[PDB]
Design goal:
- This protein is of the alpha+beta class and 385 residues long.
- The chain has 13 helices and 14 strands.
- Helix 4 crosses helix 6 (144-167), helix 5 (109-118) packs across helix 6 (144-167) and helix 12 (293-311) packs across helix 13.
- The structure holds thymidine-5'-triphosphate (TTP), magnesium ion (2 copies) and sodium ion.
- One magnesium ion (MG) binds next to strand 1.
- The protein binds a DNA duplex (7 and 8 nucleotides) through residues 14, 34-38, 40, 54, 72-73, 75, 78-79, 98-103, 216-222, 252-253, 272, 275-277, 279-283, 319, 332-337, 378.
- It is classed as transferase/dna.
- Keywords: Hoogsteen Base Pair, Translesion Synthesis, Nucleoside Triphosphate, TRANSFERASE-DNA complex.
- It forms a trimeric assembly.
Length: 385
DNA sequence: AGGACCC
DNA sequence: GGGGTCCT
């Protein structure tokens, strides 16, 4: 009545898979996908040579001299594949939540229940798992929660087979009773495998983490807070004072993350649907000062207008984002947004009006005389209607 | 407009 | 990096 069956689907090395498919000459070769000076991801043949995700490019060559690099700055193809994955999952069950370009959650509860109603009860004893059971736990076929999670593992196997057969992509899946545990357990056997978590092994999974930052929803800021309070292990967080936690983190963070530490997560799988925003970025070391900016902003706009135009919906808010330096200081970018004028929402002719909007938002932020040094320009369209 | 989080 | 999400 309360218990869900959730699957987390997590594609392997995603950008590298897409590049490997584009150029099968790279299939047997160690491969990294480069963005500026970063190897943002690499295929499992590069990982075996000590190439790590988000390793810089000199370190990466220094580790594996023969490593092949492919430019991954233009995300168009990865983004297109990513939506082909999500739509394929949506055909299984429509409630699909995207997390970045390579992870999806699906709530399988209704689908599991319909499949169980189809079984005759002399076939119920015949239910088997597909893939790994976390911690090698024994299955009890008389336990309705175990039966539901096994049928979840069968649907997950079907999704994985369909993504390989229809899109050429491999990935892992985790099946569990909520999104936290599904995300945690999907990564236990990789690459290209799947795992199911039965309820009795939840504490073993959560305590398998080695630090609280590994819990999804606890990020850099929050972990740094916790560390300062002497909270380091999952058990530290489980046993820490609710009241002190509430004072330090506010009631919202405190109550939610302490529930995470126990494996409890009541958040629903939300149907992502079409995106809420479209943006593009470009990074540089001080290659923008000044009115080398309008050109860059023109190029970003050019590309973004194609995306909105192919999307079909129209954006009512535009935003310009910059980043300043130096020297070694703080993360924060700065932005300005305003509505797009009504006549302009009708996709020189579109460019000159939008660039002029953008250049004005530009001035509001940057004093074009007595100037400051830029490391990033980004345009974002949002408020899609 | 900026902050936290996610990939 | 080069994207995204939602909340304050
Ligand atoms: C975390 C992260 C991922 N990405 C991109 C590169 C990846 O192909 C996609 C990576 O998301 P992930 O699922 O973290 O990684 P993956 O698909 O590369 O690797 P793994 O097999 O362990 O799952 O996101 C970034 O560009 N910046 C980031 O900070
Ligand atoms: Mg992932
Ligand atoms: Mg992945
Ligand atoms: Na985390």
């Amino acid at each position: 009545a309360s218990s869900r069956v959730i699957v987390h689907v997590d594609l392997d090395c995603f950008y590298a898979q897409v590049e490997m498919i584009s150029n099968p000459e790279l299939k047997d070769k160690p491969l990294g996908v480069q963005q500026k000076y970063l190897v943002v991801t690499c295929n499992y043949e590069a990982r075996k040579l000590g190439v790590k995700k988000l390793m810089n490019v000199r370190d990466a060559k220094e580790k594996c001299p023969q490593l092949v690099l492919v430019n991954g700055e233009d995300l168009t193809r990865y983004r297109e594949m990513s939506y082909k994955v999500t739509e394929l999952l949506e055909e299984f069950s429509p409630v699909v939540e995207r997390l970045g370009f390579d992870e999806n959650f699906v709530d399988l509860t209704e689908m599991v229940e319909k499949r169980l109603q189809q079984l005759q009860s002399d076939e119920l004893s015949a239910v088997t798992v597909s893939g790994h059971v976390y911690n090698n736990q024994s299955i009890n076929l008389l336990d309705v929660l175990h039966i539901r999670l096994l049928v979840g593992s069968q649907i997950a196997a079907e999704m994985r087979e369909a993504m390989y057969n229809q899109l050429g992509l491999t990935g892992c899946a985790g099946v569990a009773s909520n999104k936290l545990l599904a995300k945690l357990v999907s990564g236990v056997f990789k690459p290209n495998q799947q795992t199911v978590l039965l309820p009795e092994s939840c504490q073993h999974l959560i305590h398998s983490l080695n630090h609280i930052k590994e819990i999804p929803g606890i990020g850099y800021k929050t972990a740094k807070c916790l560390e300062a309070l002497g909270i380091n292990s999952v058990r530290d967080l489980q046993t820490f004072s609710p009241k002190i936690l509430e004072k330090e983190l506010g009631i919202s963070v405190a109550q939610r993350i302490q529930k995470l530490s126990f494996g409890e997560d009541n958040s629903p799988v939300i149907l992502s649907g079409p995106p809420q925003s479209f943006s593009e970025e470009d990074s540089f070391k001080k290659c923008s000062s000044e009115v080398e900016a309008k050109n860059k902003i023109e190029e970003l706009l050019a590309s973004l207008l194609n995306r909105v135009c192919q999307d079909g919906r129209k954006p009512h808010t535009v935003r310009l984002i910059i980043r300043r330096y130096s020297s070694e200081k703080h993360y924060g970018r700065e932005s300005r947004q305003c509505p797009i004028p009504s006549h302009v929402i009708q996709k020189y002719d579109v460019m000159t009006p939008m660039v002029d909007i953008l250049m004005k938002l530009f001035r509001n932020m940057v004093n074009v005389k007595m100037p400051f040094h830029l490391t990033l320009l980004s345009v974002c369209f949002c408020n899609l209607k």
